Amino acid sequence: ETITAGNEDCWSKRPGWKLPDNLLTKTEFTSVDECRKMCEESAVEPSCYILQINTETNECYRNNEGDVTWSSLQYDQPNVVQWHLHACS
């Protein structure tokens, strides 16, 4: 799945992807829209580009690394989904 608000920001989904907690920063958002909005707008480096959402609590986390350590990835995990920000046309 891939979505966009027609603003050059595209989001793609990765159900079941889970980075470990130490590679994430919990945000104040429990709305995916607001989390994605914050991510697209945050200018603070390390730049936000990966969100991970606890699907039973809706807590949204963002990558805390400038370059995500994907070697620590777990997939086919339950209750979690990631959203990936990609610049697009």
Curated annotation (Swiss-Prot):
Record-level Gene Ontology MF annotations: toxin activity
Tissue expression: Expressed by salivary glands.
GO cellular component, one term: extracellular region
Modification(s) after translation: The N-terminus is blocked.
Keyword Signal (UniProt): yes
Protein origin, superkingdom: Eukaryota
Entry keyword annotation includes Chloroplast: no
Record keywords, A-Z: Disulfide bond, Hemostasis impairing toxin, Platelet aggregation inhibiting toxin, Secreted, Signal, Toxin
S-S bridge residues: 10-88, 35-60, 39-48
Chief site of localization: secreted
Functional note: Inhibits collagen-stimulated platelet aggregation (IC(50)=60 nM), dense granule release and serotonin release. Does not inhibit platelet aggregation induced by ADP, arachidonic acid, and thrombin.
Protein name per the record: Leech anti-platelet protein
Species per Swiss-Prot/TrEMBL record: Haementeria officinalis (Mexican leech)
Lineage of producing organism: Eukaryota, Metazoa, Spiralia, Lophotrochozoa, Annelida
Residues of the full protein shown: 58 to 146 of 147
